[PDB]
PDB file of C-alpha atoms and ligand atoms in Angstrom:
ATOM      1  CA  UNK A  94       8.256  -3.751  -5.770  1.00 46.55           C
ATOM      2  CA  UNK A  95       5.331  -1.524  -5.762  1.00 48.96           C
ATOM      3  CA  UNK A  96       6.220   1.353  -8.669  1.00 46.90           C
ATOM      4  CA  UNK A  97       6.691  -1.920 -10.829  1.00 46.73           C
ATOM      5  CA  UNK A  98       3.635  -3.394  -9.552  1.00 46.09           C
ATOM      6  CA  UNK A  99       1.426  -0.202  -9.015  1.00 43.82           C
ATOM      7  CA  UNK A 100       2.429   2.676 -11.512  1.00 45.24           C
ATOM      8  CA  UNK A 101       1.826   1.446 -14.720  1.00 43.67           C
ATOM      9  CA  UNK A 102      -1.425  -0.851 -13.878  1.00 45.82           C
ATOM     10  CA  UNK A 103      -3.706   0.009 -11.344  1.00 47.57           C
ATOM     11  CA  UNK A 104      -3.224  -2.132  -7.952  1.00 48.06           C
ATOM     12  CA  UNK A 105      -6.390  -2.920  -6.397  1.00 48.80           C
ATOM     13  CA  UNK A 106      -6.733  -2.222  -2.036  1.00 48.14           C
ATOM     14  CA  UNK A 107      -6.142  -6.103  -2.315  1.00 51.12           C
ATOM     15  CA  UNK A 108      -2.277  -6.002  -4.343  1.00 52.17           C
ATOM     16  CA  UNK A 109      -2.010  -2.999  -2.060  1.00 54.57           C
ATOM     17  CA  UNK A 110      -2.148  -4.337   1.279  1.00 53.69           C
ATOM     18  CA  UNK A 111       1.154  -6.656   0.143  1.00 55.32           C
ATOM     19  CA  UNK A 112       2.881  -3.771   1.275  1.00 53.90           C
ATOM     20  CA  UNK A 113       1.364  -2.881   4.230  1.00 53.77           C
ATOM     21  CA  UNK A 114       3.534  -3.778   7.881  1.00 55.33           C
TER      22      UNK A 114
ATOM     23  CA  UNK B1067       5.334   5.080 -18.829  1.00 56.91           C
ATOM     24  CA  UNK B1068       4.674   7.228 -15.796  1.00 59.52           C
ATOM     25  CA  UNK B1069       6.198   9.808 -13.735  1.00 61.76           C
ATOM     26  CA  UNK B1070       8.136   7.584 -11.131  1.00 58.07           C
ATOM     27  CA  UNK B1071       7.323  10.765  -8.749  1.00 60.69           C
ATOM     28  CA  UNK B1072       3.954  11.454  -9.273  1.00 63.88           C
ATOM     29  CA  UNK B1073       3.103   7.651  -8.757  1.00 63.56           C
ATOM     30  CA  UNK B1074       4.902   7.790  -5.544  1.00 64.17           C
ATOM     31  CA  UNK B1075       2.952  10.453  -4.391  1.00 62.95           C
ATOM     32  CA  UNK B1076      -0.291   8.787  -5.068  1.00 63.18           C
ATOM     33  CA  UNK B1077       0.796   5.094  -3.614  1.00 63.92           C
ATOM     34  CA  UNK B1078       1.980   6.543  -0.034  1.00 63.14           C
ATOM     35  CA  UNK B1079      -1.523   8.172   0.184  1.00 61.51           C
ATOM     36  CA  UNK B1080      -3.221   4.860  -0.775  1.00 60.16           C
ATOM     37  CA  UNK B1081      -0.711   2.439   1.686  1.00 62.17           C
ATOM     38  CA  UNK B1082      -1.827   5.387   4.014  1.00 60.38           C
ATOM     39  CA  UNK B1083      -5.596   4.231   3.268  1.00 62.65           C
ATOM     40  CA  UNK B1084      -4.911   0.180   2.496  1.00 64.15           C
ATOM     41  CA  UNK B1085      -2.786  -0.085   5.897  1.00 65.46           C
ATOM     42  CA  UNK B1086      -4.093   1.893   8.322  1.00 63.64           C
ATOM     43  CA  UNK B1087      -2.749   1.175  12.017  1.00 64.27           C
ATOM     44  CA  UNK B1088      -0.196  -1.469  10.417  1.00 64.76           C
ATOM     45  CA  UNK B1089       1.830   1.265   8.790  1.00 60.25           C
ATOM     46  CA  UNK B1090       4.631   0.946   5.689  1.00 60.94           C
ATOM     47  CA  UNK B1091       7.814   1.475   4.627  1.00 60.93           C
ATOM     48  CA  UNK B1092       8.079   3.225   1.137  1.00 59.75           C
ATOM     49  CA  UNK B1093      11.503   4.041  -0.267  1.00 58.58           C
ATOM     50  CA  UNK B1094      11.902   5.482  -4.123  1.00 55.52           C
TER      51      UNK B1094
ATOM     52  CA  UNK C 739       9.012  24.160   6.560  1.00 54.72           C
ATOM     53  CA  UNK C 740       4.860  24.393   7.590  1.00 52.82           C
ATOM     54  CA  UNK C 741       4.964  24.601  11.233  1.00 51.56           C
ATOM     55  CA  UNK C 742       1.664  22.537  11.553  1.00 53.16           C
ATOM     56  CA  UNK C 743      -0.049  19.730  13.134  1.00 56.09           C
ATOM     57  CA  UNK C 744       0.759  16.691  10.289  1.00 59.44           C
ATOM     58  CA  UNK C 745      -1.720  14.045  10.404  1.00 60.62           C
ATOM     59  CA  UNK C 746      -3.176  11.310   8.008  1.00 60.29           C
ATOM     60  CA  UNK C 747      -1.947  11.271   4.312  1.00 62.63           C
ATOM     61  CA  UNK C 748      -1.016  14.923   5.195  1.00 61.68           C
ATOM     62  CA  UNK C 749       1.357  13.495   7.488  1.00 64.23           C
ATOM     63  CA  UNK C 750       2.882  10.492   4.815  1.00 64.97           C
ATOM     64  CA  UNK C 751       2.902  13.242   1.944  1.00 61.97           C
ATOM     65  CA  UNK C 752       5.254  15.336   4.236  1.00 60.54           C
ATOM     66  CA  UNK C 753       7.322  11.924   4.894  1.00 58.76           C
ATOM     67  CA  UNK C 754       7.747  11.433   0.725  1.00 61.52           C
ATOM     68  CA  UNK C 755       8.948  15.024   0.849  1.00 61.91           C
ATOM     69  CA  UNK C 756      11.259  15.362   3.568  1.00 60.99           C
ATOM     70  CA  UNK C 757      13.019  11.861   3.535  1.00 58.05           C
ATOM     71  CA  UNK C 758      13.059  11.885  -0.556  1.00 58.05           C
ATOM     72  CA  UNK C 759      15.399   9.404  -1.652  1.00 61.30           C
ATOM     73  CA  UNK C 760      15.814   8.212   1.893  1.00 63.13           C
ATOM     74  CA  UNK C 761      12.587   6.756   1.987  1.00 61.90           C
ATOM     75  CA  UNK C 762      10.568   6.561   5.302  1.00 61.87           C
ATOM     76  CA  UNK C 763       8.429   4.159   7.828  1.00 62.76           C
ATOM     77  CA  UNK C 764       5.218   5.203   9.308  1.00 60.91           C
ATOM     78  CA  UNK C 765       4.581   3.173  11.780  1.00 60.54           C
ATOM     79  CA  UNK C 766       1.788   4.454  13.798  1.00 61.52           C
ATOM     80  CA  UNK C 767       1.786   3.199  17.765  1.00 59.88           C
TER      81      UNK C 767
ATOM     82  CA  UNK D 784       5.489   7.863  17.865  1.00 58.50           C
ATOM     83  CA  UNK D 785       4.985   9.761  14.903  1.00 61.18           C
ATOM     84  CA  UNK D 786       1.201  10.605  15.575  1.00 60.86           C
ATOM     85  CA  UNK D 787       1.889  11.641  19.075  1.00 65.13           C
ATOM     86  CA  UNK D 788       4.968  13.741  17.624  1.00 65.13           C
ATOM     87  CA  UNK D 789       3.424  15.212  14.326  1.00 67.12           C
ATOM     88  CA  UNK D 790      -0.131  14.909  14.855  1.00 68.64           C
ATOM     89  CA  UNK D 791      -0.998  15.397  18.134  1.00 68.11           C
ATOM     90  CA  UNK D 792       1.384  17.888  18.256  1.00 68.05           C
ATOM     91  CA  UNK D 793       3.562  19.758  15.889  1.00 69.96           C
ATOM     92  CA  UNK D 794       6.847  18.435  15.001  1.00 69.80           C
ATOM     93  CA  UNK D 795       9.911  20.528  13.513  1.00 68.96           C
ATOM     94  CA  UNK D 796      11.748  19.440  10.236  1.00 70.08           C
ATOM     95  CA  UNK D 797      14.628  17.562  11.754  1.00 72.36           C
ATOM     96  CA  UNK D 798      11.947  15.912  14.280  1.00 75.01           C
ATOM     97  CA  UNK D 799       9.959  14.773  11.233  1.00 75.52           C
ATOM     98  CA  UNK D 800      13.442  13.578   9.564  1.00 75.17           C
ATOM     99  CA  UNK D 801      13.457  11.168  12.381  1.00 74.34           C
ATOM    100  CA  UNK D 802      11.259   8.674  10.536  1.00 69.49           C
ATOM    101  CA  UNK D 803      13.265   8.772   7.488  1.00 68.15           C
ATOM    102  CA  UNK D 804      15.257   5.614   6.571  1.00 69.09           C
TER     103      UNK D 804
ATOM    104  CA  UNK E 937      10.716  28.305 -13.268  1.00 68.67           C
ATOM    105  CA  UNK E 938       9.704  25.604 -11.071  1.00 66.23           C
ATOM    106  CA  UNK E 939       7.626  23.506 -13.855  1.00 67.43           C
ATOM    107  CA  UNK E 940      10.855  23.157 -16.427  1.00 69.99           C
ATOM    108  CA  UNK E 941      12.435  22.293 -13.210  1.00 69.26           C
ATOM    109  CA  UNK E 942      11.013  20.150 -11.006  1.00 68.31           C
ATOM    110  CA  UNK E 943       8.327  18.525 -13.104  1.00 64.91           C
ATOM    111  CA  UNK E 944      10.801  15.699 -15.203  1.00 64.76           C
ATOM    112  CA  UNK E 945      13.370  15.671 -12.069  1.00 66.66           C
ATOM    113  CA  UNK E 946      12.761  15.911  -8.918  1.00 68.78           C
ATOM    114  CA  UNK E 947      13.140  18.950  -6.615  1.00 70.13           C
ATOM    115  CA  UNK E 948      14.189  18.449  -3.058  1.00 75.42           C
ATOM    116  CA  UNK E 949      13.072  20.239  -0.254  1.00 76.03           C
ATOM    117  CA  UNK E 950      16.252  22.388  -0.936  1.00 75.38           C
ATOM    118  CA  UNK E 951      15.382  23.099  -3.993  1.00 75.92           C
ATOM    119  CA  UNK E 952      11.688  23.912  -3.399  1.00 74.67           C
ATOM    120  CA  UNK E 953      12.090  26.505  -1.166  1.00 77.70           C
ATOM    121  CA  UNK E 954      13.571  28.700  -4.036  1.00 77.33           C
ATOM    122  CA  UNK E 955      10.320  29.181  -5.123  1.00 71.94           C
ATOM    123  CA  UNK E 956       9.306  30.572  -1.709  1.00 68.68           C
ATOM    124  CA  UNK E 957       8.305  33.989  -1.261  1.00 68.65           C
TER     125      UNK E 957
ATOM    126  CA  UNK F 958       7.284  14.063 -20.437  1.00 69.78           C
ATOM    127  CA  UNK F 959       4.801  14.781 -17.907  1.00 72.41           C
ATOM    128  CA  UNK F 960       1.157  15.950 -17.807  1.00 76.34           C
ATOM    129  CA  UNK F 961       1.523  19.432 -16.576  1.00 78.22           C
ATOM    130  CA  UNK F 962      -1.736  19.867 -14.926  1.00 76.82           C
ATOM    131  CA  UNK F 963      -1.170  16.790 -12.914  1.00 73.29           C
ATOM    132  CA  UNK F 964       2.521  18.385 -12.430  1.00 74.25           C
ATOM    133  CA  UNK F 965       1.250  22.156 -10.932  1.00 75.09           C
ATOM    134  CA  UNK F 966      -1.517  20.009  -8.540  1.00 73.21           C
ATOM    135  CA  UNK F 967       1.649  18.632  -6.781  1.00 74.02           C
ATOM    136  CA  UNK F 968       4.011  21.192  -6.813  1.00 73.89           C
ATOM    137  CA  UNK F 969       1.306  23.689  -5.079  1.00 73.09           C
ATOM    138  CA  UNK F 970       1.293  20.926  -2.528  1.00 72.44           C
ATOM    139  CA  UNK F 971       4.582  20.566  -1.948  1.00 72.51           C
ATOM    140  CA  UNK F 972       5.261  24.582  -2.144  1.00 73.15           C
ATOM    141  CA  UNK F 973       2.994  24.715   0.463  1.00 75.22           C
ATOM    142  CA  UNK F 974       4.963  22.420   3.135  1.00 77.30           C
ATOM    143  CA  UNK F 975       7.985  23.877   2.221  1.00 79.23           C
ATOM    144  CA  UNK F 976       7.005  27.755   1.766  1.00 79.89           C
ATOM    145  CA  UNK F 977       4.922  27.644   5.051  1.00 79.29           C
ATOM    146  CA  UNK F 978       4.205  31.056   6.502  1.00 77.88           C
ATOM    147  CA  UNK F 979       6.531  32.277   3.811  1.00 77.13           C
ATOM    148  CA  UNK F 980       3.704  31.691   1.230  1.00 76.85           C
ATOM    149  CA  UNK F 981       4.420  31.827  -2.284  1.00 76.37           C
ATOM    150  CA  UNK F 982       3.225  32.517  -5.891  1.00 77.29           C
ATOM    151  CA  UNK F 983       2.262  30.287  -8.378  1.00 77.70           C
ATOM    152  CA  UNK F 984       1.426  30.693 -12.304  1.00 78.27           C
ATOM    153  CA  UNK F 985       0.905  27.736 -14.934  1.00 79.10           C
TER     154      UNK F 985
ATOM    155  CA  UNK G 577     -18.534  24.743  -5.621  1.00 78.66           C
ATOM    156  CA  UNK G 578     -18.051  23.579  -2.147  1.00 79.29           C
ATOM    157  CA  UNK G 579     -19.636  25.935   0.643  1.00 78.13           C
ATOM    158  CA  UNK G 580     -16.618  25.110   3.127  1.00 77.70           C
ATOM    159  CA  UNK G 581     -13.478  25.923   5.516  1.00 76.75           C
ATOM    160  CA  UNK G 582     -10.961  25.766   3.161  1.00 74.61           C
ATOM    161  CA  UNK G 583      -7.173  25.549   4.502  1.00 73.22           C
ATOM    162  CA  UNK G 584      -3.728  24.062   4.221  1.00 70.98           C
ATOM    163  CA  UNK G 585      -3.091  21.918   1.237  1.00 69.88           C
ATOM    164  CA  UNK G 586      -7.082  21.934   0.645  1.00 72.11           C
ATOM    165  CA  UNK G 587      -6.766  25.841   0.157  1.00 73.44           C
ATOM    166  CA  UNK G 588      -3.948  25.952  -2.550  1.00 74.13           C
ATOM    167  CA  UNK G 589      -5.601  23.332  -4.647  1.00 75.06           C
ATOM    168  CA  UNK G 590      -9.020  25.028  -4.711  1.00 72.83           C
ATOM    169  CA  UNK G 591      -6.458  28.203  -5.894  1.00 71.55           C
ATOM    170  CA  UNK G 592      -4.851  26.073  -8.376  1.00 69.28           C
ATOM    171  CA  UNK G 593      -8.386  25.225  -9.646  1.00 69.32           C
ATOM    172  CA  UNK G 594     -10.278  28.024  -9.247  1.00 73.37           C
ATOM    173  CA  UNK G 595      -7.742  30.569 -10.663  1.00 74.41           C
ATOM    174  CA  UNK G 596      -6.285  28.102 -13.847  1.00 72.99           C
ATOM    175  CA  UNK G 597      -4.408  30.249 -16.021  1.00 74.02           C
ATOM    176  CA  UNK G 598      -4.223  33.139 -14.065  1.00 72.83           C
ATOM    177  CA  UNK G 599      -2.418  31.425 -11.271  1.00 71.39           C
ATOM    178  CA  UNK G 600      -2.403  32.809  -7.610  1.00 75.49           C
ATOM    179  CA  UNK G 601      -0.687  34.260  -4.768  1.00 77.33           C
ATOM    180  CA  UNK G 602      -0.779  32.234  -1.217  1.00 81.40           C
ATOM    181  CA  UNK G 603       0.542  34.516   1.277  1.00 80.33           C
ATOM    182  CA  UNK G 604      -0.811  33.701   4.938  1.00 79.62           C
ATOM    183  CA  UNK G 605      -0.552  36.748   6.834  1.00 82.39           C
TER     184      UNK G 605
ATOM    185  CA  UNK H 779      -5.785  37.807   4.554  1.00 81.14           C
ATOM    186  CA  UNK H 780      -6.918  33.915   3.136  1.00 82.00           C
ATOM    187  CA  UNK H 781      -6.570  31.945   6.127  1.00 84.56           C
ATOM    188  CA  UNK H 782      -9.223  34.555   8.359  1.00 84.47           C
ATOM    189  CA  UNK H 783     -11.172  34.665   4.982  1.00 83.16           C
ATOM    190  CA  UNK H 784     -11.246  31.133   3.703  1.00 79.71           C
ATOM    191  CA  UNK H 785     -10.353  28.815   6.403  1.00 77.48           C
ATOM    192  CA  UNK H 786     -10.925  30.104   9.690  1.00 79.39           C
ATOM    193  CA  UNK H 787     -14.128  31.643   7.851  1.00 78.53           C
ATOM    194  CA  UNK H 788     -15.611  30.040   4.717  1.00 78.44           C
ATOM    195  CA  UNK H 789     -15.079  31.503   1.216  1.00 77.47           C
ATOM    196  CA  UNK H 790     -17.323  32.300  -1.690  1.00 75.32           C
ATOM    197  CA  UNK H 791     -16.120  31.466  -4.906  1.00 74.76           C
ATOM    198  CA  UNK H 792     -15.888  34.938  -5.900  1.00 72.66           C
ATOM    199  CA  UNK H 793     -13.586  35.195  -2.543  1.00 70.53           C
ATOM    200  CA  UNK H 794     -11.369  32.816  -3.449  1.00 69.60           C
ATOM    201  CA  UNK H 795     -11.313  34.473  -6.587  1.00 66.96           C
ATOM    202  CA  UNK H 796      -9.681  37.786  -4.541  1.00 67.50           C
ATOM    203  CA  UNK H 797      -6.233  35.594  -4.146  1.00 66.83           C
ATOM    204  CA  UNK H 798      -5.812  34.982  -8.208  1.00 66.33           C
ATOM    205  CA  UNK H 799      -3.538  36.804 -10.289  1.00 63.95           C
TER     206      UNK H 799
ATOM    207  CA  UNK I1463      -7.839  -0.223   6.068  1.00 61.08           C
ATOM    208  CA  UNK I1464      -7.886   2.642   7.817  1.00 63.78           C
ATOM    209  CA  UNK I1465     -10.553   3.492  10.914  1.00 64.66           C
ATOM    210  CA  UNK I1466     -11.288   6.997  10.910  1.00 66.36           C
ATOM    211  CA  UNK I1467     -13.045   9.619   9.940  1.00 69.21           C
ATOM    212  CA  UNK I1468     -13.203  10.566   6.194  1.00 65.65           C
ATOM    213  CA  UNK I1469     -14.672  13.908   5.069  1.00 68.96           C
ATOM    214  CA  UNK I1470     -14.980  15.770   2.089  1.00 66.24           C
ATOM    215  CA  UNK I1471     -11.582  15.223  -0.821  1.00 69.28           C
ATOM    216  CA  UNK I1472     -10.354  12.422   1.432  1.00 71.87           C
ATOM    217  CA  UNK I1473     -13.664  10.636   1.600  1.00 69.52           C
ATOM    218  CA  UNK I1474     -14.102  11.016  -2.959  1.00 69.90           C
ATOM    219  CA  UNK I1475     -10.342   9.697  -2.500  1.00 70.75           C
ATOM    220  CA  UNK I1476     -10.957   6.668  -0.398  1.00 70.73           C
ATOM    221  CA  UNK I1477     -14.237   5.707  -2.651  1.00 75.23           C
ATOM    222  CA  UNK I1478     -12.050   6.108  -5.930  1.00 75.71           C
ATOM    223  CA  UNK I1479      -9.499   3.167  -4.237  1.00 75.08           C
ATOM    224  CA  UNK I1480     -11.968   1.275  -2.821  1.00 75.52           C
ATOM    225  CA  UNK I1481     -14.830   1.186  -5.170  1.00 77.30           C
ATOM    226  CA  UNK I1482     -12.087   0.660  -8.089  1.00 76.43           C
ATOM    227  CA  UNK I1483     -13.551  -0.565 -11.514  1.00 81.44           C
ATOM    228  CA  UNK I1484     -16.959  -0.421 -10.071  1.00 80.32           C
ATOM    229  CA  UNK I1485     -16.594   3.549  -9.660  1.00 82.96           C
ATOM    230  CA  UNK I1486     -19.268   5.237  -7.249  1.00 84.30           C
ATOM    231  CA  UNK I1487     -21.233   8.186  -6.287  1.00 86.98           C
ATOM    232  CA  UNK I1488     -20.693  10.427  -3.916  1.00 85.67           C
ATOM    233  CA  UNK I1489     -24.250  12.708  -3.042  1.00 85.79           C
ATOM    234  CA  UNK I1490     -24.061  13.782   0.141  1.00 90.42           C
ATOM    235  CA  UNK I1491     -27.520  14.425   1.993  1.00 88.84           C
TER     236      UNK I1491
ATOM    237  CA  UNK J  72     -26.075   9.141   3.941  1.00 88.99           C
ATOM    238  CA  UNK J  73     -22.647   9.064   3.396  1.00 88.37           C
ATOM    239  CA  UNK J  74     -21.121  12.392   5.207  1.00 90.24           C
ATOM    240  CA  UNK J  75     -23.505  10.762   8.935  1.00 88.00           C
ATOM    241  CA  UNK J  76     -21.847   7.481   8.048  1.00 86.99           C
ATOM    242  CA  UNK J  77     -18.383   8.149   7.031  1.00 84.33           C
ATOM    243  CA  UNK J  78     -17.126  11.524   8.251  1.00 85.11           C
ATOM    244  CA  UNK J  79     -19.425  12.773  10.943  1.00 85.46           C
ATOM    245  CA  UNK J  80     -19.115   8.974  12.402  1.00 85.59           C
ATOM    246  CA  UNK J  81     -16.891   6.354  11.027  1.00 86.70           C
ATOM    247  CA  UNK J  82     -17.071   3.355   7.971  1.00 86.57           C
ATOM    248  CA  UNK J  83     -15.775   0.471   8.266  1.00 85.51           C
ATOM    249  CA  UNK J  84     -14.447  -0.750   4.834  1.00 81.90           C
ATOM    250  CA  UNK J  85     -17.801  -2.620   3.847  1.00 81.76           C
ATOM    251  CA  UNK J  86     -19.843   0.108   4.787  1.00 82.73           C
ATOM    252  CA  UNK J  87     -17.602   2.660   2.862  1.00 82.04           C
ATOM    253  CA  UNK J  88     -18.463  -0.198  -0.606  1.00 86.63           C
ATOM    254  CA  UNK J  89     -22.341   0.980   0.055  1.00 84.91           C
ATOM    255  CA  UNK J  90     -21.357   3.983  -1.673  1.00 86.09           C
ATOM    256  CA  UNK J  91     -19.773   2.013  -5.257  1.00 83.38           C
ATOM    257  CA  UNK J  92     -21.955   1.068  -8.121  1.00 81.29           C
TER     258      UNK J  92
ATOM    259  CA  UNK K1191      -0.804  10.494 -23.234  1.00 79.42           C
ATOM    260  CA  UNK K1192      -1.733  10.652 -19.299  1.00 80.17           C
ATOM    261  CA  UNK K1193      -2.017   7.850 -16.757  1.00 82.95           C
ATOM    262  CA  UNK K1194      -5.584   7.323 -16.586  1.00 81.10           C
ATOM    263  CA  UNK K1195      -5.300   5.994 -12.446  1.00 78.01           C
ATOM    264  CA  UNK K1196      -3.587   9.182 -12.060  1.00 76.11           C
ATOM    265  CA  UNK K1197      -5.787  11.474 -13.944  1.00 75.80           C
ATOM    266  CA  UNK K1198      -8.758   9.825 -12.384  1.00 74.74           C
ATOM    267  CA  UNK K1199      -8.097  10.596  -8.640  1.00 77.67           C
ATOM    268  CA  UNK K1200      -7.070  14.367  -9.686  1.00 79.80           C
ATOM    269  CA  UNK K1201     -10.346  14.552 -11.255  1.00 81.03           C
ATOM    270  CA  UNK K1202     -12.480  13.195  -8.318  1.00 82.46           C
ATOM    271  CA  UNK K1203     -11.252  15.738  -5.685  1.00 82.11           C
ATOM    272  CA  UNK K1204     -11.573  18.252  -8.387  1.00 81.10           C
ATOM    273  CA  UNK K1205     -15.311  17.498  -9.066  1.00 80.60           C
ATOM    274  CA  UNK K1206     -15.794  17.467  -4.842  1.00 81.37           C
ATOM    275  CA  UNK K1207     -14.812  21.295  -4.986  1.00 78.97           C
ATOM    276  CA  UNK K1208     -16.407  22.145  -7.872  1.00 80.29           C
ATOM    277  CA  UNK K1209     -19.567  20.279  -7.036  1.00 83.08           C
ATOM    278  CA  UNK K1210     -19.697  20.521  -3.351  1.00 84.00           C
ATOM    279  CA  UNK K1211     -23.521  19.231  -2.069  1.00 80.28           C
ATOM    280  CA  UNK K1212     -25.232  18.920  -5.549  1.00 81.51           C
ATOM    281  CA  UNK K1213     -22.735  15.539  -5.714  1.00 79.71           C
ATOM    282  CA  UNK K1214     -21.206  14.031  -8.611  1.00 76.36           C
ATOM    283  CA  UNK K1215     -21.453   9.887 -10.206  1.00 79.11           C
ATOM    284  CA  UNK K1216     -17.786   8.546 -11.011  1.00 79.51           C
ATOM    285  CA  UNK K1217     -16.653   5.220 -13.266  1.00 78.37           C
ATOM    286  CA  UNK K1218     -13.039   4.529 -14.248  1.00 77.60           C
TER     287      UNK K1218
ATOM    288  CA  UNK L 745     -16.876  11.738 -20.803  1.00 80.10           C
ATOM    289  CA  UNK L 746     -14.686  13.365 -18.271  1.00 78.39           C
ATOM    290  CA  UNK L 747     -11.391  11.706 -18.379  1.00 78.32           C
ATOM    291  CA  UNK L 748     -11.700  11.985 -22.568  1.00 81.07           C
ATOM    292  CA  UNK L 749     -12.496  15.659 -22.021  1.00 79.20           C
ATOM    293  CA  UNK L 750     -10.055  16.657 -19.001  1.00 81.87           C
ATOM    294  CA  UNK L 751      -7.086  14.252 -18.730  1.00 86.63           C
ATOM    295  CA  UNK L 752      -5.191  15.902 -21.759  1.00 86.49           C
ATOM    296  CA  UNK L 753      -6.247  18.903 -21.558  1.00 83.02           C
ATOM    297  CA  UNK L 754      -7.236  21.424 -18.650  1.00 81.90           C
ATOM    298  CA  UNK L 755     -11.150  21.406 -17.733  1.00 80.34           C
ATOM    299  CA  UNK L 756     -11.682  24.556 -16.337  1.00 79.54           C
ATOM    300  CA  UNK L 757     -14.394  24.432 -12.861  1.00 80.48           C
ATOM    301  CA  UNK L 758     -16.970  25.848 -15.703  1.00 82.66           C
ATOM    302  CA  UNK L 759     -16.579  22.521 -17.661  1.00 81.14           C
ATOM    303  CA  UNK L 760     -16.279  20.361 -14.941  1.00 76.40           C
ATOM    304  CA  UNK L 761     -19.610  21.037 -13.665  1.00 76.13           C
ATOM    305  CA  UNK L 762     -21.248  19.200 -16.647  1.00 77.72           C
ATOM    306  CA  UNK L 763     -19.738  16.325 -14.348  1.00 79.04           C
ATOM    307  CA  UNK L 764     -21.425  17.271 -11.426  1.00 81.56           C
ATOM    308  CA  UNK L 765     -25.491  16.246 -10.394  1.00 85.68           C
TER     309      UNK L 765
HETATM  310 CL1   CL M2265      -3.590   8.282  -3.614  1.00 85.43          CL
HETATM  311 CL1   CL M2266      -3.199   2.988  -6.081  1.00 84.49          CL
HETATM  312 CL1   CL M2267      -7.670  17.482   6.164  1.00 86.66          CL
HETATM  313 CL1   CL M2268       7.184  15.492  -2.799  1.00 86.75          CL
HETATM  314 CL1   CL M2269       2.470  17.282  -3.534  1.00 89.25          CL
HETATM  315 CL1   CL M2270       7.924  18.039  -5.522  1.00 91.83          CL
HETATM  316 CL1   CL M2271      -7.378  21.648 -10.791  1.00 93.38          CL
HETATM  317 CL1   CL M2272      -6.567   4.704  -5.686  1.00 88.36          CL
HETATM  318 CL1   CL M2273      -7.475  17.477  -7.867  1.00 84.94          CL
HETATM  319 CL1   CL M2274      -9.111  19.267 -13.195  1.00 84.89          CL
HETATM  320 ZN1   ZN M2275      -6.834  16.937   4.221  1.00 86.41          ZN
HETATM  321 ZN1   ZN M2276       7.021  16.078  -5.039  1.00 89.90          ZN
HETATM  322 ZN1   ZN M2277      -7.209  19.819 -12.211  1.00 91.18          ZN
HETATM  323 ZN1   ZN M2278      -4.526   4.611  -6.788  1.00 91.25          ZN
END
């Protein structure tokens, strides 16, 4: 999920838009 | 390790950004 | 509560308030 | 939707609650 | 006050709006 | 343990939503 | 510092910033 | 008061400076 | 990514995401 | 420069990458 | 010890106020 | 540089503006 993914290394707008609708 | 809150904060604001018109679901 | 118009990340910061451990959707039209 | 609701206009506490899971 | 608080837990809404005027 | 700057910067934010017209004080 | 309308959320931070250890009082009338 | 000052008008620094403790 | 405007704190904020490791500058005329 | 492109008008997302080093 | 992602997009809207139209350079 | 000088501890706007151009 995105905290694991996206808190402690830094998600790019590219790993980001995973969790887009 | 971070504050699970703080990071929260900051990734809605950035899915706000990333997605645009598509939207998101976020749950903590 | 702000009696405001909410729009933008304003608008999805109020969301990660209100609906805490809830969570919410923003689904814009 | 929530822009028309919230941004557009100005939505109440429980009215914003509506897009809470 | 509100730091020792709500800064390593989490204050609600609810909580919050003790620190209100 | 969380940075406490980074801590006050949100809780203003959030103060302010919830406060409203109501207003409040803050001191770090 | 910025030369602009300053309000809302926008507002309190430049308080938080500009007053640091003092703190401040945001009290809309 | 801060909004007439600082929003609906635009602030100084030294204005903003009024609303500090 | 969003379409809309993007002024002053939320413009920084959408260079800091999108310029990432490359950083940026932000000099306005 | 950036404020006519960005906020006065609008970016798109390659437009808004002008602006990184 | 701070989360450097975090600190980092305090710090740029911090630098636009402080700033304003003289500008500022930012690298992570 | 800035995040060495103001992640850990507070930068004041008087030491941020070595930041600024
Ligand atoms: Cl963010
Ligand atoms: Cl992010
Ligand atoms: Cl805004
Ligand atoms: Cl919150
Ligand atoms: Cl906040
Ligand atoms: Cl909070
Ligand atoms: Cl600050
Ligand atoms: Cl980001
Ligand atoms: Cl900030
Ligand atoms: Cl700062
Ligand atoms: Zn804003
Ligand atoms: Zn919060
Ligand atoms: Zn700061
Ligand atoms: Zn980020």
């Amino acid at each position: 999920g995105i905290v694991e993914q996206c808190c402690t290394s830094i998600c790019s707008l590219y790993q980001l838009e995973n969790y887009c609708n | 390790f971070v504050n699970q809150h703080l990071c929260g904060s900051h990734l809605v604001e950035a899915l706000y950004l990333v997605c645009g018109e598509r939207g998101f679901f976020y749950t903590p």
